[model samples]
Target: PNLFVALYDFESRTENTLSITKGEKLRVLNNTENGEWCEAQTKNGQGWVPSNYITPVN
Candidate 1:
C-alpha cells in the first residue's frame, strides 16, 4: 500500500471524526492536489479537507 503525511493543521471537525495527526497514513479518497482542498474517508466518517495541509508519500 501507499502512504502520505499531514503537512500541518490537518483535521476534520465533522463530529465524531477520527482525528488524524501529523504523519497519519490516510488513504486519499478524493485528492485535489491542484486545488486547495481534498476529500478523505476514515472509519469514523467522510469529509473534505485542505490539500495545503498534506503531501504525497511518494
Candidate 2:
C-alpha cells in the first residue's frame, strides 16, 4: 500500500500521537474505519494521527 502525507500541522491527540508538521510524510501502520485516525511511523517514532489531516502520498 501507499504511504500517507501530513496535510497540516498536528498535535498529540492520543496516547500514540504523532507530532508532525504540514507536508511531512508518514509510513502508515494502521488506519481507522472511518478514516478519522491512523497509526503511522514518523521520524520520532510510531504514533496515531487524524486521517483527515493527512493525504495519500502518490
Candidate 3:
C-alpha cells in the first residue's frame, strides 16, 4: 500500500465507504477502476472509495 492523493474530500454515505478528507492520503487494498468505484482499505477496514475522488495510484 502507498499514499494516494484525495483530490477532494470524500464523504462516506454507505456502509461500504470510508470517509475521506481533503489532503488525506489513503491506502487502497483493492483496486478496479474500469468504472467509477474502487475498494480502499481505511482505518483497519475496507470500503468502496470513489474513483472520481482520487487520482490513480497504480
Candidate 4:
C-alpha cells in the first residue's frame, strides 16, 4: 500500500504545504525530487511534506 502515517504535527507554513497531525493517515504519491519530500494527499487536500516526517504503516 502506498500509505503512511504522520510521525509529527505539522502546521502549514506556506500555501503549498498541508497541515497534518501525528496520527493522521497520509496518502503518499511518488512525486519526490531528490528524496527529500513527498506529495501528500488526504481529506481532499494536497501538498508536499518531508519524507522523514512520515513513516510507512506497518
After superposition, candidate 3 runs with Cα above 4 Å error: 56-58
Model 3's alpha-carbon lDDT is 0.69
Against the true structure, what is each candidate's TM-score?
0.58, 0.81, 0.66, 0.83
* lDDT digits (tens) for residues 1-58 of candidate 2: 5687889999976676888899898898887888788887888898888878888888
lDDT score of residue 26 within candidate 3: 68
**Which window of ten consecutive residues has the lowest lDDT sum in model 1?**
11-20
Clashes of each: 0, 0, 0, 0
Candidate 1 structure lDDT: 0.60
Q: In candidate 4, what residue range of length 10 has the lowest lDDT sum?
A: 29-38
Q: What TM-score does model 4 achieve against the real structure?
A: 0.83
lDDT of candidate 4 over 1-58, digit per residue (tens): 6889999988877878888889899899876658888889878498988888998886
Model 1 residue 47 CA deviation (Å) reads 1.5
Ranking by TM-score: 4, 2, 3, 1
Regarding TM-score, does 1 or 3 come out ahead? 3
Worst 10 residues of 3 by lDDT: 37-46
lDDT for 52 in candidate 1 is 62
Q: Please say which candidate is ahead in TM-score: 2 or 3.
A: 2
- Give residue 42's lDDT in candidate 1 (0 to 100): 51
lDDT of 1 by residue, 1-58 (tens): 2345666756556753345567665666665558766665555456666766667788
Q: What is the lDDT of residue 15 in candidate 3?
A: 83
